[PDB]
């Protein structure tokens, strides 16, 4: 499913016309501020519900966890420790 | 004399009230009910340990930075 | 004809680093099986430098590092290096395998390589697992104990195969020569294998993260991606730089600096982090055969995402459901992996058994479930 | 910059034998800066702050 | 599990060596060999620490020779193969107080005094942890507490009943450098000085790393310029399309 | 422009400078490593003082496990060393070539032939005999009767003070 | 999965006016929120390729519509890697999403599972 | 190269066990140095100090 | 404080001197060699053991 070069295995190509210019001259860094700002937060606002969401769910999970674990271990939660095992 | 000794004691009676009254507190009812008989078969036996960390690490962060300034 | 491609062995090289076709579009996801080399590579010399001045005896092992520690010329610091690259090899084995199961890369026609690439994962978790118990402190001899004595679940045969394994009746010293003899070549084997995968993918190519074919659009590796992985070793060498220097033992257990006492057990017997998550799973299960197929299970069933994911498109790139699922996967992964190290206590039990039921239904029920409806979306909705 | 461009960058012979010789110096000088300023923002803590008492 | 079962976790202090730049106070680490020397040394070995590691830290070659020839030191046997002493030298460990662990043991009511040469890396808190043990014994113990004979309260100890007594009183010590050796005094030193005997490599390092920081962040730095420099004809392609 | 070029070249070069620094520090601490250790260079240079050494009599040193003879010889002893023509002589050399002060005879007390511990004060030439295969050392411990091929090794010694060697 | 499987299951849905009533509409807001016509692709132009089955369908597109699909691929390709989005009329509209492979793929994939029936029959 | 030259390396690689074999259960010193036995002594220097026989 | 045991099979066999100096001292200098290896620690194995021993 891969050839090299000369025969990489591409359907025909036909009718596409590609440009470019050197490195040496273009300024590598042009519309780095704008990409660094708006670019930037574009593209996380379009991810962000996919990482809150299970890191807010599970983060709570622990929370709850963590926290009825630690009271079961006090003095005040002795009977509802004694139930728990 | 030790800088620990006056620091503790500031911190004890100032932001730290609440924990060493909840403290004196326990140990009032824990020595009491020591006095009491019986109390040798009794199944729970109640300590202070817990009111006593509370107040520990209370005292302990209004002084670690102080003490150290003075060593 | 240039040299770099009439000559065979310098047309091997050529071939898979610098005429090797890529996709233009990879992103810095694709940079993690660059950065395993590197730990393979800083493993390989550290590792082979520690075994210098190391002494596998049991009566002198623990302070052999004590004297590399203290005595020899940086020997602090290749100690803190071999040490640390560990957890890094993991973060970054954990990245690759999260990068790969993200964009599709063990679909079709990529299976072969995937599927060596979950023996490597075996391979590295034993590596890994024997070099701990090299240092021979209270970890090293009661972590090699408790993972040693789930051998004993095999039936019939088990008892026989731990004997066996330890060279006597307990953990010991045959115990301890044997693991340095093994650690010190399973890198090799390690790297055989790291080779492998990647003549296995050479016949595809690189995936990428559109999922697409790269057949239309290819760049050469070098000077393309040389540059850009350079970019993210000098990352890599940073966060080095800050564990290794500046937090040389955040990432362990202080119990390791007490020599190994087959009287004393520690508060809690653990292993390392990069392995918790298989130790919740292993706890889930209540009997003792059961944890420990659950445990490779978990492992192993990685095999068959290849046939569990019935979409047809590659990776998660536009199918918004799927990366939901992937994230709440990931997560619950890492919540595994806190419950490995929390007490045996309420209500830590029955959360480790939810979080182990969630793992597998990921691969045997959610994956299948959400890949199909996902393929009937996008053709109705298209339409 | 044609003349510096000349000399020390168009032979890669050159470039390199200017890049190893750049090396060798900053090395040796930045090993002498850090040296310095290590010791002024740790001063009166080392050894060698209070040896003089011994 | 309880918290006292845990132990009480340590306040953290300031100390001269936090701080990704700062050294030990050396100091400090001298003032603190002398507390392991007349207190910690009756009951606790330090066997990892030769004489010549005292050197150019807090002593120097003279006054370290000069403690180690105070030593008798097990000689190769004579001629007729009887046993020999010798008197000290810098290669020599520093020696313990006991021949063995039954001894030890046996002089501390059961318990075994551990080695300090790794106290600090093998105890979570490292040199908070010590510092807030030596100076947290209770006059009287939380009210409900009872103690296993031969046992003392310290919170910070996991359990609360730790085999070791109080030890640094006000005035045990008189520093050779005039400093009052209050409790927290002493306990401050003789800390900073069992976190130098577990770390020793410790200043160095940090300045190696220092180092290593501003050298890395540059390469980073040039290593953006020139990806961007070499990958912007890729990125700053154009395409024109004629369908055929 | 040339400018234009330079200016993409000084970025390449800086980066290759500080590579080129980077791997120098680094393989030069890293291959450190394989250099004597601080515990084995801790056990080179023995000290011996030299006040305690009365006159007649020939001490011994262990450094590097081997045996050190140290004799503190006298006027008389050191003639009759001076004495023998360095012709007449297996390994041909004068005190003056083996000892850097007459009266300190510093040497590594096994026997050049097969390597036993030659007994002093006894020999022939009255100075060490190896009982081994009888071969006799001097008062400069030179070799002159028996299997022995080359006078007793002298090691790298130097007096710090007048009253301490260091070997 | 097999693009047949895929059409048919959504023939069944699509006939029903209940099932359609509620899946129409969820198809629908899927694709918005997939984007991939924000990357100018049609949805066919993401199906897997390499396999038997697709290399053959791909052979059979005419030549317009193959030259058209390298297009897509090659300008999202540059997309992905600039980080950028489509806008104006790189932008696939709804109206051009058109499934110009899936007849292909379902005559390549028909012969070939009536070829695995036809191996498998039973004289009677 | 199989299975021409597969089973005519098995006849060689027999032929190696068995002088293997009588060297490994029946001469296991022959090949080797006395002294090798006796455990390294800085002071004493062997009568001859020769390289294994290959060297 | 030190004690001692009788010997088990697990003991190797006690030798005659407690030290390399005890052992020189008692032979008039020469170290009398161990003898469990010696038989390979000496061309002629056997044979030159009995050949000394007898001759
Ligand atoms: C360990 C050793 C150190 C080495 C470090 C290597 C790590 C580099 C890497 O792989 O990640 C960089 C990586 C940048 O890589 P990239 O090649 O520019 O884009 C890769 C994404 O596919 C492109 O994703 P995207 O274009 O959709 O952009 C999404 C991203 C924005 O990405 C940006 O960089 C902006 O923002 C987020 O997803 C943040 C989530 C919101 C939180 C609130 O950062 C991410 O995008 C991380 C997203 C993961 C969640
Ligand atoms: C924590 C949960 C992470 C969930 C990620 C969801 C997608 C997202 O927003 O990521 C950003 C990006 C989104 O990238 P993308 O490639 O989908 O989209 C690029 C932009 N468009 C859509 C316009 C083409 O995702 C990644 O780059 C994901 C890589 C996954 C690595 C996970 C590591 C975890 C290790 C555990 C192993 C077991
Ligand atoms: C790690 C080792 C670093 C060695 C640095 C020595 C100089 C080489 C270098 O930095 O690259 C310059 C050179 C050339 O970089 P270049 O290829 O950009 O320069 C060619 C164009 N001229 C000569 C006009 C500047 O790199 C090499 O020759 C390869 C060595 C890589 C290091
Ligand atoms: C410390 C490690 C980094 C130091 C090496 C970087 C090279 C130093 C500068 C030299 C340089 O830039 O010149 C190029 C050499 O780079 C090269 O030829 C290599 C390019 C990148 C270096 C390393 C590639 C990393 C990729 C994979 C990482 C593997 C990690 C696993 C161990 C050739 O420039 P040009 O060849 O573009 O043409 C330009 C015309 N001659
Ligand atoms: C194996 C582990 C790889 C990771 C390397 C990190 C730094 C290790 C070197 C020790 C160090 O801290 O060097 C500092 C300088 O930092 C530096 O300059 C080193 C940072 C550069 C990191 C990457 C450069 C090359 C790494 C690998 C190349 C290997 C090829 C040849 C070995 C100290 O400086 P010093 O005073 O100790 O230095 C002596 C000459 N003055
Ligand atoms: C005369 C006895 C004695 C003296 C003096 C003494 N210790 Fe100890 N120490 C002990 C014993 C016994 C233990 C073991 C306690 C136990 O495990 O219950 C101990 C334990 C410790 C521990 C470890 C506690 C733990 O977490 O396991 C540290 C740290 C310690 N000592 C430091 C010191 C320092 C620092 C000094 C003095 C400057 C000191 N000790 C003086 C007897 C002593
Ligand atoms: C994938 C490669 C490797 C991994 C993941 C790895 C992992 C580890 C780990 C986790 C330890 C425990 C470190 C500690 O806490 O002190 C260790 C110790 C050790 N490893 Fe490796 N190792 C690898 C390669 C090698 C190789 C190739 C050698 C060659 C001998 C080696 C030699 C050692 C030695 C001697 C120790 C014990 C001394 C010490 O603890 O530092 N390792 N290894
Ligand atoms: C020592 C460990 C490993 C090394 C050095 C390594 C190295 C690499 C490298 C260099 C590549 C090509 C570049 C890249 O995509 O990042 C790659 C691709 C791949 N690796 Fe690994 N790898 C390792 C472990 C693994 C593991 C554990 C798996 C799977 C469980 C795996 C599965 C793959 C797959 C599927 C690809 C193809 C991904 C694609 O391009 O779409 N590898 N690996
Ligand atoms: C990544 C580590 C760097 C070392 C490289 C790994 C060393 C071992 C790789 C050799 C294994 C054989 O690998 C195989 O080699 C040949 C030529 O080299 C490649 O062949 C490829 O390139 C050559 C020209 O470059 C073409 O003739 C051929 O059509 C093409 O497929 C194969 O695609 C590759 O799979
Ligand atoms: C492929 C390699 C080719 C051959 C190259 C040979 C390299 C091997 C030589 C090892 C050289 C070590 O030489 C020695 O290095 C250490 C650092 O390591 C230096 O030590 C110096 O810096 C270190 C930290 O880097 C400090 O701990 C030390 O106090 C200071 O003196 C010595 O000043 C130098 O004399
Ligand atoms: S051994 Fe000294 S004379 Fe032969």
Redo the contacts between chains.
Sequence with gaps: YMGWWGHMGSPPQKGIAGYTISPFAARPFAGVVHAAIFNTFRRTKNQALFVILPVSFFYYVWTQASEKNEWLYTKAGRHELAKAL | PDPAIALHEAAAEGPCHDFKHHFDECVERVTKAQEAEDYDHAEYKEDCVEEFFHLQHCINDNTADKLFRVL | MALRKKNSLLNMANSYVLDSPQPSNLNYFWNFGSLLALCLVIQLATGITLAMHYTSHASLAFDSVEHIMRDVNFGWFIRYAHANTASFFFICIYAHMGRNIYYGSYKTPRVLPWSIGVIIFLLLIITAFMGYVLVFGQMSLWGATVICNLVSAIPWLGEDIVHFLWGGFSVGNPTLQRFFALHYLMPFVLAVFALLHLIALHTAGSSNPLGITSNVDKLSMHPYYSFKDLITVFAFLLMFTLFVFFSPDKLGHPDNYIPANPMVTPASIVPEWYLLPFYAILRAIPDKLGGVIAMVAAILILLILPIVDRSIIRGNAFKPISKLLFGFFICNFLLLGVLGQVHIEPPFIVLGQICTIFYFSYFLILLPMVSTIENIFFYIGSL | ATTFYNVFVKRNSAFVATILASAFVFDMTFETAIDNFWDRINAGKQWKDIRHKY | ????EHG?????????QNG????????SL?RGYQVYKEVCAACHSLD?I?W??LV?????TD?AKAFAEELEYDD??????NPRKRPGK??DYIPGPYPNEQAARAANQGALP?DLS?IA????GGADYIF?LL??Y?DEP????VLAPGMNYN?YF?G?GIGMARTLF?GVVEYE?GTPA????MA?DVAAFLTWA?E??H?E????????????????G??????????????????????? | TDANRLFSYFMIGSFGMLSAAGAKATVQDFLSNMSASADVLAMAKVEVKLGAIPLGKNVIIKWRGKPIFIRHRTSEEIEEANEVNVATLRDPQTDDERVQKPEWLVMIGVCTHLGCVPIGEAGDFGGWFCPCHGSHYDISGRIRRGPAPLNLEIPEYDFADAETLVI | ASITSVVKTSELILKSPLLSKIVVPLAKTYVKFSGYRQLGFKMNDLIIEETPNMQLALRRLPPTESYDRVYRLIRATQFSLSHKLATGNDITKPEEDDHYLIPYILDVEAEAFEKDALDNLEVV
């Design positions: 599990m309880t918290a006292a009480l976790h340590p306040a953290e202090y300031p100390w001269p990704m730049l700062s050294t030990f106070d050396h100091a001298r990892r030769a010549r590691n150019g830290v807090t002593h120097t006054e190769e046997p004579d001629d007729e193969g810098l290669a551990p790794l890396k093998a105890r979570h807030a100076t947290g209770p939380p009210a409900g507490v919170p996991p609360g006000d450098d209050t409790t927290s005094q401050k577990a020793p490599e200043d390092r940090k300045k190696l790393g220092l180092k290593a920081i501003i050298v890395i962040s540059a390469m980073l040039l290593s953006v310029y020139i990806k961007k420099f070499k990958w912007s004809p890729i990125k700053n392609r154009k395409f024109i399309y004629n369908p055929p």
